[PDB]
Amino acid sequence: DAQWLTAEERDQLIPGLKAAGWSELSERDAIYKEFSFKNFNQAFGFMTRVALQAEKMNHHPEWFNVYNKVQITLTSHDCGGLTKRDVKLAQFIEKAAA
Amino acid sequence: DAQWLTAEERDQLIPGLKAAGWSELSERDAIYKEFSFKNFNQAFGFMTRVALQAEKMNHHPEWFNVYNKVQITLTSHDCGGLTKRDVKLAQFIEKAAA
Amino acid sequence: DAQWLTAEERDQLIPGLKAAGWSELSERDAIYKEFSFKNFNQAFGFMTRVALQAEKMNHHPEWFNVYNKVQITLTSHDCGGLTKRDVKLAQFIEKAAASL
Amino acid sequence: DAQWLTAEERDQLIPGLKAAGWSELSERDAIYKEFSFKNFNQAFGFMTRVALQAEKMNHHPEWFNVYNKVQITLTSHDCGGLTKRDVKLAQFIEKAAASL
């Protein structure tokens, strides 16, 4: 889905991500989460899984990494807000991190 | 360790790998295992973790992949047999696959 | 395309791949090429680019790697032969191997 | 090397990195450069090569990526400044970005 999340969609989809540790940013319609792995080997393997999914979906994260930490911000730059693509990528990221 | 595994070392280290599904090849002093993941995303993330470890250890697998399957053969080409490096890489691979 | 290459498509698409060093396997309707890099760092970086494309196009290689060598066989298992998807993937692989 | 670069080492090693486009950060004893690629496929392939080297040398970058852009900051957190390990990693990164 490429359109902005509606109010109903947000209520359906975002609370589960928040329970998983995602937060909504104050300055942007975007979601954010920092992941902490044991080490860089785990973190980068995880990033690779996310990168593969990003190319599958043609939807890419904004992310920062140092060693075992990966900070991920998701939003859809083509419409300047959250879409179902961001939700789907977040849900995949949760699977990959597990 | 870069020297061939001694008989005692083999008895100490190989049975655990065999219990995990590794086998010894008939034609070469090498160990082998096929891993089966859900899909290529999982398989390639796993390969990436192994690749990182391979560069950390300077010790590389012989491996075949198609989609969700990864076949790995470990042996030390510099001395033409199994060494502790092969055991350590196999043990890491077991962690990464889990 | 999910159907086997026609005779016409083979005459149009394969010569360029052969010129680039791919061969048609004797026992399978598949194409094959080995790539050699300076080391594993380069070889695996290349494999990662191919892996990303494989997920983008939902079409996957058969491949073997040992250190700096990557042997790639392309064919479509869902129909048991060579399709336009295999040609497209080969063309990407050529770009990646040449660092384009 | 795990100790901060000496004055002499800085005069010998940094100019080449500056010539290659690295800057020394104002607020940290660290070097910084942004790399731009054609797309994410290329950018992430490059990141994978850097990741492999990071594990080889047990020394890791700080980096940010969005699509085709990769921003890299190098510094050694174990001592809180720039070391020979950072210079070595930068030199590898230059090779990787140039497809060498």
Side-chain angles (χ1 to χ4, degrees), chain A residues 40-42 44-45 48-49 52-53 92, chain B residues 40-42 44-45 48-49 52-53 92:
Chain A
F40 177 79
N41 186 110
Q42 288 188 352
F44 199 82
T48 298
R49 292 195 63 196
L52 289 167
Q53 187 69 9
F92 174 84
Chain B
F40 177 79
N41 186 110
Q42 288 188 352
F44 199 82
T48 298
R49 292 195 63 196
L52 289 167
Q53 187 69 9
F92 174 84

Side-chain angles (χ1 to χ4, degrees), chain B residues 28-65:
Chain B
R28 313 168 67 191
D29 185 27
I31 57 173
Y32 173 84
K33 180 171 166 182
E34 173 177 80
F35 293 80
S36 184
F37 302 89
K38 196 129 191 270
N39 56 36
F40 177 79
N41 186 110
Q42 288 188 352
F44 199 82
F46 158 83
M47 292 176 67
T48 298
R49 292 195 63 196
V50 177
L52 289 167
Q53 187 69 9
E55 283 295 302
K56 180 174 180 161
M57 295 179 70
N58 195 19
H59 197 70
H60 300 81
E62 299 175 10
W63 51 3
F64 174 80
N65 161 249

Side-chain angles (χ1 to χ4, degrees), chain C residues 12-17 19-37 39-87 89-92:
Chain C
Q12 174 209 347
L13 299 171
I14 301 186
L17 294 182
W22 292 81
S23 65
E24 289 185 67
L25 290 182
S26 60
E27 295 292 354
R28 299 174 75 192
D29 187 28
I31 55 174
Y32 171 77
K33 181 171 170 184
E34 180 179 70
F35 294 83
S36 187
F37 300 89
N39 54 35
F40 176 78
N41 185 109
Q42 289 186 4
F44 199 81
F46 159 82
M47 291 176 70
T48 298
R49 294 194 61 195
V50 178
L52 289 161
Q53 189 69 8
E55 284 295 307
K56 181 178 183 175
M57 71 185 293
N58 189 209
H59 199 71
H60 300 85
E62 299 182 0
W63 50 4
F64 181 84
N65 162 248
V66 182
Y67 194 60
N68 65 319
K69 304 289 186 179
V70 187
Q71 296 170 318
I72 302 183
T73 300
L74 301 180
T75 191
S76 301
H77 77 90
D78 59 17
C79 62
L82 208 56
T83 70
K84 298 183 209 59
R85 293 166 293 170
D86 300 305
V87 174
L89 184 51
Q91 292 171 338
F92 173 85

Side-chain angles (χ1 to χ4, degrees), chain C residues 39-42 44-46 48-50 52-53 92 96 99, chain D residues 39-42 44-46 48-50 52-53 92 96 99:
Chain C
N39 54 35
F40 176 78
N41 185 109
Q42 289 186 4
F44 199 81
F46 159 82
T48 298
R49 294 194 61 195
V50 178
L52 289 161
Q53 189 69 8
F92 173 85
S99 297
Chain D
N39 54 35
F40 176 78
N41 185 109
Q42 289 186 4
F44 199 81
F46 159 82
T48 298
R49 294 194 61 195
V50 178
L52 289 161
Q53 189 69 8
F92 173 85
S99 297

Side-chain angles (χ1 to χ4, degrees), chain B residues 4-15:
Chain B
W4 280 3
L5 290 184
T6 66
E8 187 180 21
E9 285 172 329
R10 289 165 189 269
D11 186 57
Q12 293 174 328
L13 301 170
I14 299 304

